[PDB]
Design a protein around this nucleic acid. Sequence first.
RNA 1: UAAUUGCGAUAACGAACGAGACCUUAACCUACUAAAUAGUGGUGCUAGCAUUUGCUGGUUAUCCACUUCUUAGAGGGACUAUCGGUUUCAAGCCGAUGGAAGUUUGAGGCAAUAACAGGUCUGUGAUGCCCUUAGACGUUCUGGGCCGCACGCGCGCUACACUGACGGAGCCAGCGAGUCUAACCUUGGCCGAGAGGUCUUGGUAAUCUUGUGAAACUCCGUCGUGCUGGGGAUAGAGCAUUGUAAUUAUUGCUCUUCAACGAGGAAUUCCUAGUAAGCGCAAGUCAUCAGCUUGCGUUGAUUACGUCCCUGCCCUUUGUACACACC
Lengths: 206, 55, 63, 145, 61, 142, 143, 56, 69
Amino acid sequence: FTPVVLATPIPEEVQQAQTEIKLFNKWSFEEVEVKDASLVDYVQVRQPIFVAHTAGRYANKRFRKAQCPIIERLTNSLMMNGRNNGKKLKAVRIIKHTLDIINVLTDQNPIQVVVDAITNTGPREDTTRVGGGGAARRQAVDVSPLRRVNQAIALLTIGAREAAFRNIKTIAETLAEELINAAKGSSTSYAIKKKDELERVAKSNR
Amino acid sequence: TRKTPNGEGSKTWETYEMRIHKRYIDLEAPVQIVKRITQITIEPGVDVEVVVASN
Amino acid sequence: TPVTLAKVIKVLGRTGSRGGVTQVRVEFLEDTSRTIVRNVKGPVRENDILVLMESEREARRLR
Amino acid sequence: SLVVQEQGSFQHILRLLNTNVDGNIKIVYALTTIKGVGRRYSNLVCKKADVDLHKRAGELTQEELERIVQIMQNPTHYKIPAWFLNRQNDITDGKDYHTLANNVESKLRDDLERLKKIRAHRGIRHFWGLRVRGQHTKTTGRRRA
Amino acid sequence: GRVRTKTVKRASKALIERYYPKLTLDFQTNKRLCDEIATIQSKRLRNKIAGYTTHLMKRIQ
Amino acid sequence: SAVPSVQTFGKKKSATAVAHVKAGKGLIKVNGSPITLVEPEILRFKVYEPLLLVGLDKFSNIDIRVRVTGGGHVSQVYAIRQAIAKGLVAYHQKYVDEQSKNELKKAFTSYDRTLLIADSRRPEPKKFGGKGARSRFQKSYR
Amino acid sequence: PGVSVRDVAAQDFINAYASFLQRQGKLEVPGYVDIVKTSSGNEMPPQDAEGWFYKRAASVARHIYMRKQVGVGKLNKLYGGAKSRGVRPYKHIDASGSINRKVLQALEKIGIVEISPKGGRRISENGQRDLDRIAAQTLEEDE
Amino acid sequence: ALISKKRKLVADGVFYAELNEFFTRELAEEGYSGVEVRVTPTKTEVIIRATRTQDV
Amino acid sequence: QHAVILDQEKYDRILKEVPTYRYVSVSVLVDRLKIGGSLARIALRHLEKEGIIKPISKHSKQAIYTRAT
RNA sequence: UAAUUGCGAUAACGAACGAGACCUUAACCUACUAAAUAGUGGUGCUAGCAUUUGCUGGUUAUCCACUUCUUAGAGGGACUAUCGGUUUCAAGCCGAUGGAAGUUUGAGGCAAUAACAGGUCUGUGAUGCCCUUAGACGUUCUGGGCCGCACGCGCGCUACACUGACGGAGCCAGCGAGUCUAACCUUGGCCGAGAGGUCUUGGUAAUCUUGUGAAACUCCGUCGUGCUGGGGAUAGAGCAUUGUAAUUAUUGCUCUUCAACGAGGAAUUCCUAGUAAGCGCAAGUCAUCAGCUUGCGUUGAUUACGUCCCUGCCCUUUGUACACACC
Ligand SMILES: [Mg+2]
Ligand SMILES: [Mg+2]
Ligand SMILES: [Mg+2]
Ligand SMILES: [Mg+2]
Ligand SMILES: [Mg+2]
Ligand SMILES: [Mg+2]
Ligand SMILES: [Mg+2]
Ligand SMILES: [Mg+2]
Ligand SMILES: [Mg+2]
Ligand SMILES: [Mg+2]
Ligand SMILES: [Mg+2]
Ligand SMILES: [Mg+2]
Ligand SMILES: [Mg+2]
Ligand SMILES: [Mg+2]
Ligand SMILES: [Mg+2]
Ligand SMILES: [Mg+2]
Ligand SMILES: [Mg+2]
Ligand SMILES: [Mg+2]
Ligand SMILES: [Mg+2]
Ligand SMILES: [Mg+2]
Ligand SMILES: [Mg+2]
Ligand SMILES: [Mg+2]
Ligand SMILES: [Mg+2]
């Protein structure tokens, strides 16, 4: 990789695992592809980045939340529940610990494991809140691709947060379990319990 | 402070401020150029203090 | 269990008394010879792909 | 690496100071089940009693248990300063004590009766069953009991 | 949103009428013209006016 | 003798990272310690990204002193990475030729997270009537 | 070639100089140690009662060395933290002073520090060398 | 003498109001309109304005 | 309840089970065996004698080990 | 349109207050004017690592140069610019590109006409009337009271823990303040587990406290789901600080007692970007006491970019037997 030397050393696992390919933490950003259409252009995995923490600005205009990578959109949705707000640093460390667990469980790429997850969890069609004439009925409406990614991370994180609450596991673990049970939809997942409940209600009163 | 006298109604808070500007110029000159420097450059609202040297 | 792909053409307006659903015109993706009116709950831009469940239906305004 | 077994050397639930101290919880925090010993006191005694803290109470020979016990009632003698003690400079004898076990419920009642016999202000609040540290009883303390 | 006020637009209808040869399509030069044939008491109004006069020019021509 | 040095600065929130870039051997140090030891930790690669988005060899001719004052632990990291990614285009601007500087300008801004454009967000003032910027105190009516 | 303590990872550094001081013996641990919480803001005493004073001392030697002079006070606030005052909110509480002091007066005996103008303690040349020396050893910990 | 400058210009501002009011109460029928204070090196200057300056 | 001292025959479990799993962690041991967890962390350090397992990410919050070699 | 803000429609035409302009404050300036109370490079002087020049420091001014970061004077900067989608192709809105900045650039100050039996006589040596005026409703002094506790209601602080606690170790702000005929903000040396003490010190302040070495946080370690080391109420004992005076515990410290609290019923508050939330810090109060308020900065996100379904206000229409105006 041409190990160049400068006055201050700089490591060789550093120099190589970067200038060559701009991996993730050290995951491959190439060769991972959104296995479901529609949801593409919203599952941002074509621009690489090292850490899951960016000085972002995705709350100015309406449609710039998607140019934020789905990884850091995964991580940011972790750091919630009062005692957890703002603690982005911990979430990265949890997430880096969430991927490396998953890359140990079932080979593959964890960034493909995450990608697989967000997709098979977004509710294709939802129940909206109509006036419904008194006893408000429920009106079936299929849901935006942006919201199938949004409400996914919501459902997936809520899944791990409620999992490892009064439980021995760490977030990183329950997160690494909640993705694996969503990246191939074992229906053991909490998100998948959620998803196949929502489309289940829309499929009813329509 | 609070706007109201006594504590009636909404609690609305003014904030007053005062802007105090300091600065300093350093000079070197003998006899006449020292007392002249003092009182020839004077203007109300301007506080002036002129210092010997050393300690 | 068939699955619909539907590409956006034009934004019609916002329905629901709450402003809860947005209408849009979608190109049928695999059958460009179609175009149908739909109701979305999320925020839908142009050119993204809806995933319809009943490839008939097509209703209108809502409260 | 404390991967040791111990055959019959581990014996859960012993008895000290007329309490039922659990064996398989850490030594420091095992002891605290006694009315009178607490975190920092039980952290120090085991120190003065040469006890390897990394262990649980289920270990520790009766040697290492009478070594602690002895130190605990006479704490002042083993480099343990009077301020570590719950009852320093009394009001009857003027010395330093660390009332333990049953003895805590004892001098707690005695003291309360002490200023109740004398019928002071802080005493009466203990008789009625109210607050003694002149705080607000108007809005708070409700539900009672 | 941004709706420029009459005091602005009044001033754009006047400079365009009184100075069409010397105005132009660019924002920068007009800003300098304004500090000549007009007395505008604040830079923003100075800029805001010239902005509107220049808007008209891109649809006058 | 005085050396050909360059001095840029990157700011973020209340952190201001001053930079010195002179013709040198290749050392890169922030506050008297090498850039490999920047120990907010998880964001380590953050400060590395200016070295890997251009070529580890574009530094072997320069020594880069950095010192941060202010901000917090995170704001110092973005402030140093930005003072560093700006001293390399300002060394090129003065001590070498243009077209490489814009290529550098190119690879930087292709991926830019602030890097050479200072993120201008700021803290909003708290108002009266509430404990935060917009958060108002709890109202009760009856 | 030429290693300062500022070339060494801090936690790796202070983890080592501590060891260096418990396998040198001649520090001077005070009479308590087994009874102090390091700060009136803590809750329990340091858990490695054997070597905290060593870790403490070592850091200070590192800490005073990357500076011009630092007195006891600035140490108490540095090694102070947060106090949980109970049902009331948390605030900063400075740390014990007869802990940092007996650290700085016993560092004086081994020649790692010394009194200094502008008050406070300055790193000594004896100390400068002792820290730069054990720094390199931690640097070259690659076999 | 020797007072903090932050209290100085404040403590002055106290002296102005106190002077300004006193004159506003004493010089009633004169029609006084305000005062200015020119602190000079040696001497301090109070400058009263009233539309009946003879009775001042 | 769990276990907080080695029962020797409990020790037999670990040496002839941990290489079964391709993920060992704090909770991994607690769930299938019945360690306290305190003696699981030393059990991890113990299992890194001569690489019964192998590290990849050593942190104070998380233990991510794998199979042997 | 946020706006009576506009384009236009036009028996109106042309105008004034308001809104807007304005002002502050936060952002941009390698362009000007400067800098021992702000910095930096050189270098004297000197320590340590290497010794191969180098890396890291020390030295209030050794001497020289300078203004990148600092402070604030002077000015520039943006006008929603340029292109595009639009619509009366009108104001305008939407999108891309650039730009420090494109939500009235963010946030504030100011703020018309008219109205209230809204509050304040307990801010005023502001004021009418009444009352009282030496057994005083004046006043000062001693003590006590405002906190008294079956309970109903509002604001809050701490929490129920493993995204944690505890112990070590790492260590990063901004808004602020601070002693004259006086005792303030206080480094530091020593003493003290502590709270604190004693000896000196700097500062009327970009100079000294103070880099306010803040907390949250990072990390290594212990504990391991156990009303447990989560929680810290109630209570006993002792040491201290404030003050003439602490009892009805002012506060501070150490040990000991280890309470309810296992996610909170019908309800209901607040919020759209450095925002919410979590975090501390100064300031007001202050002899002493913050769980309060005014501000500050650290860490910093999910979700909207919409609607009139609910509650409000606004117009317009219509009804009116209301005008002391659906009290
Ligand atoms: Mg006990
Ligand atoms: Mg007692
Ligand atoms: Mg406020
Ligand atoms: Mg704030
Ligand atoms: Mg600290
Ligand atoms: Mg700490
Ligand atoms: Mg607390
Ligand atoms: Mg807190
Ligand atoms: Mg008008
Ligand atoms: Mg006007
Ligand atoms: Mg200087
Ligand atoms: Mg110099
Ligand atoms: Mg752009
Ligand atoms: Mg009234
Ligand atoms: Mg009053
Ligand atoms: Mg209130
Ligand atoms: Mg606790
Ligand atoms: Mg901690
Ligand atoms: Mg407990
Ligand atoms: Mg306690
Ligand atoms: Mg205070
Ligand atoms: Mg109050
Ligand atoms: Mg009618």
